[PDB]
Design a protein around this nucleic acid. Structure first.
Lengths: 68, 68, 68, 68, 68, 68, 68, 68
DNA sequence: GTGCCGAGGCCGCTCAATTGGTCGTAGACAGCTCTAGCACCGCTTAAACGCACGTACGCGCTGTCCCCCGCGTTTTAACCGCCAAGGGGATTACTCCCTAGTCTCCAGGCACGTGTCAGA
DNA sequence: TCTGACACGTGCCTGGAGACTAGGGAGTAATCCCCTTGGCGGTTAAAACGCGGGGGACAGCGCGTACGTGCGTTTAAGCGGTGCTAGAGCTGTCTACGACCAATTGAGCGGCCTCGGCAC
């Protein structure tokens, strides 16, 4: 399990999109893709915060970490 | 809440990225951004499955949806 | 030229709509608008074919591409 | 034909979009869709000419019609 | 009021048409329907003036907006 | 006055649609056309009330008359 | 050329670096390579200043842009 | 000087990147860093020239040295 | 590869917005307890999905050839454009009309009950 | 020709039916000035016309995909159930934010005298 999110909560996202059936391989690939894109946003947010001088990552740092 | 993921699980990802302190507003904003990108991948993946003539969303459908 | 369709054939479509007179700049802008919308339908229809596994773009692939 | 444009010129647009093969039934449906959308832009364009009191349809009339 | 017109005036029109008695909900529904159709005529009339190259909406613009 | 509604209220509706200036003849033509279309809806609502047996024109009778 | 520094100075660096002889095309190619790396450093340094909330890029901005 | 390149030209590069202000000290550090990176490329280019047999460093030697 | 020339990299205060600080101060959270979950396992089950095979249908490629159509170029009809002189809409203050509000007395709707239609 | 949809018959309901406001705002008269025609005019153009010829629509051959479908394999959806986690949130204390205001680097003009092209 390389993905951080709860498998069932990722599955619920794909069923809410409209899927009639969702396979375990699609839940695990989705969890892995959302964990990877998350870790890219998080690392850039930590860097933005440090450049600013705050020890705390805030909403602006995440919004500014997205749109990279 | 605006995002589907568990706040503690999104926060855990931001700390793992390197952040020493994380504002709840950063966790909620991060969760909202991952949910939106997830719902776009899932809606495109459901559409790939429907076009394939297959009812079950599979691994290749998440890969193809995330690639473009 | 800016678009694929024949200028005289795009002009014929504007005169059949009712125009008493048509300026060549209006024929070119119409040809450009119909090519641009055409390439958006054809690209999405080639995706619908590739997703189906089929190689030839069939009538249903154009119908499904146009309803979006 | 119900479609107005030259079939081979509509086919060329689908092969340039990327199709490895194009069915004669997909050429006909594409020609019909581009003719219908063309006639709606052209009926709206001949209209903007009569409102303006100008007898000749010009670039601005097609540009303003395409915003519908 | 959901519609723009005077409720007492909307009711006076329904009674004048022949209705022996009138529901207050019938008055509000009539006012809403007349306001929607009114906004459609006015939006298209403002466009007729704009395309005509005039700032003032004139009588003919309401006539042309009503015929379509 | 040519129509049953308040002239200032008709004018206000045209300004709310976006008109930069509104001619007094546009107000009178708008009041006349909204009076006539309203009287047609009311005539069918009175017919539907007679067919319903309830003499008090009801909110449903207006909806059915507009849907004539 | 590709870099901001004078071609004569870029060539002088290559000869001082150890070049027994230096072609004019080698000087231009070196200047272009240094300019590309410099543009990457400059873009990251400007971002560093914006995140820190300082209008003036300082020695620290260059250090932070160089290590990451 | 801390770098072989013209300080004014290094500062001009930072300003061209969009800097609101470029500190003279940041200019010296930038010139030093561009000098070092350029010297590394030049050293590899001289090694590639020795291996090629041609004593005069050519454009290809610079490309291979930057790709070291 | 070689010698001069014509800028321009680097000096010089300058003036002040920028770059530093220290202290006060506020709304934050980390750190912990501990309840009530979503849950990720566990079977079953039987519903797709993938894979093979045989068939036929409709795309390719190759002609093919004359139906369109894209240029010129001539003639001249709309359409910008522009410059008075007109009409008529924004403006406002005002006065008296109407109308949502609402008091509140008054007879037309809406369930349940239940009997009637109707025969080639 | 049968079926169960269709009609009165009371009894209970709340809904526009009326009054009279009473002041909000819908017409009204002036006048100022800015759009709107509107006319001559000049240029920008579209429309007719005839020419060649590029290339779009057929024809038949042939062969490779697409379909359909028989069946066997591999599952995802049931949901029953043990539990490991998310969260709520009470608390202590600190990391933002903020403003006071000290030092001074970088804007700013501009010119001294050092060095990358130009010419070929």
């Amino acid at each position: 399990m390389a993905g951080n999110f709860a498998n069932a909560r990722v599955e619920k996202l794909i069923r809410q999109a409209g899927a009639q059936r969702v396979s375990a391989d699609a839940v695990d690939k989705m969890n892995e893709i959302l964990t990877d894109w998350g870790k890219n946003i998080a690392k850039y947010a930590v860097e933005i915060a440090r450049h600013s001088g705050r020890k705390t990552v805030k909403e602006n740092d995440i919004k500014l970490a997205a749109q990279k």
